[PDB]
Assembly symmetry: C7
Homo-oligomer: 265 residues x 7
C-alpha cells in the first residue's frame, strides 16, 4: 500500500502545485500589436478578439503547418484534468475496497492473535491458508486500477512529448479582423502579428512533468512484479500476495515478527 | 450506497470545481469596437451598454437566425443551478431516510448479533424474513430520486448538446445605441461589431461536461438493475434488495461473512 | 422537524449563495455617456453624480411612469434582509423552544425506556397520555413561526412579481446636472442617457427566486396539514401531533418500533 | 436569559453585517468637478483636498444652514462604535456574573436533586427560600445593564432620526482651494460643486436600523416587566425572579417539571 | 482578576479594532498639486517626494511654528506600539505569576475542602492565616504592573492631548524640490502646497481614544483602593487581599459561601 | 525557562509584526523624475532601471562617500533573517534538549513524590544530590545558545547603529542610463535625481528596534548571573542551578513548597 | 533522528519562505524602452515580446558570451524544485521506514520493560544483542537518503555558485522584433535595450542560500560519522548504531537511564 500511496498521493499533488506555480506567474494572457496609437480600447478589443478567434478559423491563417492545433490555451485546464484522472483510482480503491480490506485486516489481525493465543497455550491456525484457497477474481478488480494508472501516465508522456516539437513556431501567429473590413473596407489594418505570453513558462514546464513521469513509469511497472518472485504466478497470487505485503499496513504486535528472533535460537 | 454516493459526491463537486476553473480565467467580460479615439469612458459605456442590451431587443439586430437565444451569459450561473439540482437528491435522502435507514442498520445489526448469539448457543432468526414480507411502498419513495437524478443529467446532455450547434456564429453579434441617435441624430456611429470573450473557454467546456455525463448516464441506469438479477421483480424487491447491498454499508464483524469460510469445510 | 429544517436551512442558504453569485459578476455599477472627450475624471464625476442622484429628484426626469420607483439599487441589499428574515424563525425556535423540546425529548425517552422495562418485567405507561391532556396553548406559540415563514415568502413573490412588469424600460433613464448649469449656464451638456449595468443579471434572477418560492409555498402550506389527518382538530392537536412526528427526531432504540414486527406474529 | 441573549446576540451582529453590506458597495468615496481637462492628477488632488477639508473650514462655505455638521463621513465608523457599545453589556454580564450565576445554577441544581432524593425517600428543601430571603442589592448591579442597553438604543433612534431631516441638501456642497489662489491669484477656478457618493446607500439605511430599533425598544422595555406580575415588587424581586426564569436556562431533569403531571392525578 | 482583565482585554482590542477602522478608510496617503498637466508620473514623483521629505528638511519650509514635528505620519504605527505596550503587563502576569497563582488556587481549594471535611467531621484550618503571615514582597512585584498600566495610559492622554492643539494648521504644508532646481535652474516650479489626507479621520479619532482613557484612568486608579477598606494598610495587604478577591476567580462549591445562609439561622 | 521564553517568544514576534507594519505601508518602491512628458512607460522603465542598477555600478555615480553601500533595499529582507536567527536557538533547545529536560522533569517529579511518600511513611532522598554530582558538560551545550542569542542582538545594535549616520544623504541619489546614450548619443537626458520612498518609515524604525534591543541586552546578560549568587561557581553549577529554577517550570503539588509553611511552626 | 529532522524540516521550509519573500517583492517582471510615445499597448507588446523571446533566439543577439544561458527566469521555479527534492528523502523515510522503525521502537520498548521486570524480579535480556547480530543490509537502504540529501545540496552550491560569475552583465540584454521589420521594413525601431527587474533581489539572494548550504554541508557530512566512534565499522554498524541513538527518539522511563545513577553507588 505504502509504496503505491506514496506516488498516488505525492504526484498529482506535485502536478497541482506546479499548476498553481503556473497560476501565480500569469500576469496577462496575450499581447497584440495595435497600429500606432489609434486608441487604447481598440487595442484590447483586437487582443481579446484574436485570443477568442484562435480556435475559430479552421482555414489557414497562421501558415504554420497543421495550424488547427488549438494553440495550447489550456495547460492549467488540461493539467487539472490529468491530476483528477490520476486522483480517481485512489478514490475508487478507497471507496470500493477499503471496508473490504478493513475486513481483511480484521481477519488477519484475529489470525495473528490466534497465533498469539497459540503461543499462550504453549505455556485453528492450520485452516487459514485454506480460507484463502479459492478463485477470488475480485482482487483482480483492484489490480486493474494499477494498470489504469499506467494508462494515463503513458499518454501524458505522449501528450507532453507532442508539446516539444510543436513549440518551434506555434507561438507567434498572425490574426485579423476580416469581418471588420467587411463592415466598411476603409480603415483598419488587416493583420496583427500577435503572440502568446504562455510558452515562456509553459514549454520549459513540459521538461519537468515529462521527465518526472518517464522516471516514474518503471516505478508503476514495478507495482506488478512483486507478485512474480514469491512462488506464485499472476493467476495464482489472487489473495495472498496482494495481502501479504498489506500485512505490513497498519502496525504489528510484540511478537508478530519477533518470533523469527525467537526461533533463531 | 457507496457506488451511488461515489457519483453523487464526486460529480457535482467536479462541476463546481470546473465552474471555478472558468471563474479564474474570466479577465474581462466583453469587448466592443470604439470608433477610433473618441474617448475612454464612452468606450466602456458602449461596451457595458451592449452587454446589458443583449437580452432586451427582441427584434432582429444580429441577423443570426433565432437570435433571441440569450447569448450564453450564464454558464457559471447555469452550472451553479445544475450542481445544486444534482446535489438536492442526496440532501433529500440524507435528511429524510438516514434516520430510518439507521434504524434499519440497527435492526440488521441486532439481527447479525442474534446470529452471533445463536452460534454462541451452538457451543429467533427464522422470523426476520417475515418481518420484511409486507408491501412497503415507502422505499419506492427513496428509489424515485435515483430516477430524478437521471432526469436532470439527461436534459443537461440536451442543454449542452444545444450549445455545440449554437456556437457557429452566435458569438460575434452587432449592437447599437439607436436611442442614442434619437437624442441628436448627429454624431455617434450606429453599429459596433462587438464580441463575447467567453466562448473560447465555454464552448470547449461543453465537450467535457457533456462527455462526462454521457459516459456516466449508463452508470446511473445501472443503479436500477441490481434489483433484477437476484430472484425478485421490481414489484417484489421492496425491502430486501435496497437493504441487501446496504448490509455492506458501515462495517461487518468477525463472523458476518466468515461463516462461508467456516461452512466451506 | 426534518422536513421543516430542510427548507429552513437550505433555502436562505440558497438565496445567500445566489446573492454572492450576483456579487462576483458585479464589475462596475453604472455607465454614463460623457460628451466626447472632455476629460476622464469629469466622466466618472457625472457617472457617480447620477448614480447618487437616482433617488433624489422626486420630480419627473425619466418620463417613465411612476418614476419614483428607486430603480432597484438594492438587490444584494434587499436579498440580505429577506435571507435573514427567513433565518429568524429558526433562530427563534432554536433559542426559545429547543431546551423545552429537549425536556420533551427526555420525557418521551424515559417513556420509551419505561415501555422497555415493562417488556423487561414481562420476562406507569397508562398515565402518559393523561400527562399531555391539558390545554397547552404554548406550542401554538411555536406554530406561529410556521405561519410567519409563509408571510415573508408570500410577499417575496409579490416583491419579485413586481420586478418583471417594472423591467420594460426602468433601466435606461435620463439624468442631468441642472445645478451644474446653475453655476455658469455656459458649458456642460444637460442630459446624459445613462443606464444601469445590473438588470442583465438581476432581471433574469427574478425568474429563479420567484419560481423557487412559488414551487415551495405549498410545501410550507403542507406543514400545517399533517395535524388534520390523525383524528384531532387543530384545537386538539396541542401537544401530541407536534411531538408525535418529533418522536422521530433524534434516534430510536432496538425495540422502539420493532414491537410492530413482534406483534405481527 | 434566552429572550435577552436573542436580542443581545442577533442585533449587533445584524448591525455589523449591515455595516459590511455598506462596505462592499463603497466603490469610490467622493467625486468633484474638475474644470474641463486641466489634468488627471489635479482632479484627484482637488477631490482628496475637498474630502479632507470638509471638517476644517468652520466658516460658511456650503450656505446650507448649521453647515458645521461634519457631513456624515463616518457611518461604518459610527456603526462600529454603536455595535461594540451594544456588545459591551453582554461582555460585562458574561465576565462579571457568569461564575456567580454558575454557582447559582449549581445551587439550584443541588436543590432540585435534593427534591429528587426527597422523592427517593418517599419510596432540607424547606430552608432554601430562606437562603434567598436577604437584601441582595448585587443582582440590581446585573439589572443596570438592561437599562444601559436601553440607553444606547434610545439615542441611536435620536441619532438616526437626525439623519432624515439632515439629508435634504446636506450632500451637494461647495468647496474651494482658497489658499491655492493665495499662491498666485492667477489660474485655478475657485469653487467646485462636489458631492458625496455615500447617501445613496446611507440615507436609505437610516430607514432600516431606525425602524428595527423602534420596533425592538418595547421588547427591551418588556425585559423589566416580568418581575412585576409574580407577586413581588421591584424592591422585593431581588433574587427569586431574576433566577426563577433562569431556572429554565441550561436544562431540566426527568422530574423537574413532570411532578405537575404527576400531582395532576 | 475579572475587573482587571475586563479592561486589560477589551481596551487594547478596542484600540487595535479602531486602528483597523483607520486602515480600511485609507485610500491614498497624500495629494500634491502638479503644475497643470506637465505629466502623470512627474505628479506621483513630486507627491512621493514630498511624502518622503517630510522629516528630512530640519530647516524652516512650512513656516508653521515648531515645524519639526514629524507631521503625524504614524498613527497606525504609534497605536500598534501603544496597544502592545498595554498588552505586555497582562503577558507578564500571565507568564510569570499564573503558575504561582495556580498553586495559590490549589492551596485555597484544598483549604476550602479542608473546611468541607471539617463540616463532614461535624456530622487544621486554624493555621492557614499563619501560613500567610510573613512579609512576601513578591506580590508587590505583581502590583507594579497595575501602576505600569497607569503609566502608559497617562502619557497617552498627554500624547493625544498634544494632537488637538497641533491640528490647527499642521496639515497643509509647503514642500519643494530645491535639489531639482539645482540640476538645471530652468523648468520646474518651486513650491507645491500639498496636504495630508489623514487628519480627516485622524484628528476626530483623537477625540475617541482620549475620552475613553480619561474616563477609564480612575477605573485603573480604583484597582489600588480595594486593599485600603478591609482593615489592612498597603504595607500589610501583602498576601490576603490580592488573594481574597482572587478567591472568587475560578468557581466555588456547594458550601463555599452557603454557610452564611446556614449560619444565618 | 519562563523569563527566557518571554523574550525568546515575544521579541522576534515583535520584529516580524513590525516588519509586516512596514509591509502594509509600502505603496510603491521608488520614484524617478521623467523629463517632462516624454512617455508614461519610459518613466516606469527609467524608474525600474535605476532601482535595478543601484548595486551594479561600482564606480562613483552618487558622489556620497563610500557610495557602494547597497542603499538599504532590504529591510524586510534583513529583518526576516534577523527574526529567524533569533528564532533558531529556541528551535535548537526545543528540538535537542526538551526530551532530555522532560526526562529531568520526570526525575525531579519522582523525586518530589519520593519526598511525598517519605512524608506518608512519617504517619532514598539522600542519594539524589549525589545523582547530580558528576561533571556533566552537556548542559553547557545548552548554555551556549544563551550566549549565541547575545551574539546576534549585539551586532543588530551595530547594524542599526550604522543606519543612523548613514541616513544623512544616502537617500537622494543620482542615476543614469549611460548605455542608453551609447546606443544613439542623441535624445535621452543623462541623469535623473531619483529618490527612495523607504526611509520615511525605515529610518524612524531604526529608532525602535535599536532602543528595544539596547534596553533588553542587559536582560539577556542577566540570564547568566542567577548561577552566581547561589553558592556555586559557573564551573560548579553544571546540573543543579540550570534545573533548580527549572523546578518551577510545569507545576507543583499540594506540598512541594507548603512544607516551608509547615516547618515554620 | 532529531539532529537529522532539524535540518530536514527547517531548511526546505527556510527556502520556501525565502521563495515567498521573493514572491512578495515581484512588482512587474521586465521593462523595455519604448521609442518615445508611439503608444501604450505597443510598449507592453514589445515588453512581453522580449520576455517571451529570451529563450528562443539561439543565435547571438546579446553579445554577452555563452548568451544561450536562459537568463535566470526561473528562481521561484527552480527553488520550488530544490525544496521539494530536499523534501522527498524525509517523505521516503517517513513512508517506507516509519512502520518498521515503529516496530523497532516497540521491540526496544518491550526490551526495556523486560529489563524493568528483571529489576522487579530482583526484589531473557541476554539474547537481544543476538537478535540483531545478522547482516541486515536493509538499514543501508535508509542510509542512502542521507547521502542523497548531500547530493542535491552539493550541486545547489554549484548551481548558485554559477550565479555569481554569471551576473556581471547577464541582465541588460538587447532584443528586437526582426520579424516585425519583415512585415513592412518601414516603421519600428530595431533594437530595445531591455533589462530584467529580478537580479536586484535575486543576485543578493544567491549570497544567502549558498552560504547557508555551505555552512551546513559539513553538518550533513557529520551525519555519517557517529557510526565510526563507537567500536563498529560502517560494515558492522548495520542495526545497533542506527537504532542506538534512535533509542533516544520518543521518550524514556523512570529507570531507562537512572540505573547509571543507581549503579554509581
Amino acid at each position: 500500500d505504502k509504496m503505491v500511496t506514496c506516488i498516488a498521493v505525492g504526484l498529482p499533488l506535485l502536478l497541482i502545485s506546479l499548476a498553481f506555480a503556473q497560476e501565480i506567474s500569469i500576469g496577462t494572457q496575450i499581447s497584440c500589436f495595435s497600429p500606432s496609437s489609434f486608441s487604447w480600447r481598440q487595442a484590447a478589443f483586437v487582443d481579446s478578439y484574436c485570443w477568442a478567434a484562435v480556435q475559430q478559423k479552421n482555414s489557414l491563417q497562421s501558415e504554420s503547418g497543421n495550424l488547427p492545433l488549438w494553440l495550447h490555451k489550456f495547460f492549467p485546464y488540461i493539467l487539472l484534468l490529468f491530476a483528477i484522472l490520476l486522483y480517481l483510482p485512489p478514490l475508487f480503491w478507497r471507496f470500493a475496497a477499503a471496508p473490504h480490506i478493513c475486513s481483511d485486516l480484521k481477519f488477519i489481525m484475529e489470525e495473528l492473535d490466534k497465533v498469539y493465543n497459540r503461543a499462550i497455550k504453549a505455556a485453528i491456525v492450520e485452516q487459514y491458508l485454506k480460507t484463502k484457497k479459492n478463485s477470488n477474481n475480485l482482487i483482480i478488480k483492484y489490480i486493474s486500477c494499477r494498470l489504469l494508472t499506467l494508462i494515463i501516465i503513458l499518454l501524458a508522456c505522449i501528450y507532453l512529448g507532442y508539446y516539444f516539437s510543436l513549440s518551434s513556431l506555434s507561438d507567434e501567429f498572425v490574426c485579423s479582423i476580416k469581418s471588420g473590413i467587411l463592415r466598411n473596407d476603409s480603415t483598419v489594418p488587416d493583420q496583427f502579428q500577435c503572440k502568446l505570453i504562455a510558452v515562456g513558462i509553459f514549454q520549459l514546464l513540459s521538461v519537468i512533468n515529462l521527465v518526472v513521469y518517464v522516471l516514474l513509469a518503471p516505478v508503476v511497472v514495478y507495482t506488478l512484479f512483486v507478485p512474480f518472485r514469491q512462488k506464485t504466478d499472476v493467476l495464482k497470487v489472487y489473495e495472498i500476495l496482494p495481502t501479504f505485503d498489506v500485512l505490513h499496513f497498519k502496525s504489528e504486535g510484540y511478537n508478530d515478527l519477533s518470533l523469527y528472533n525467537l526461533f533463531l535460537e
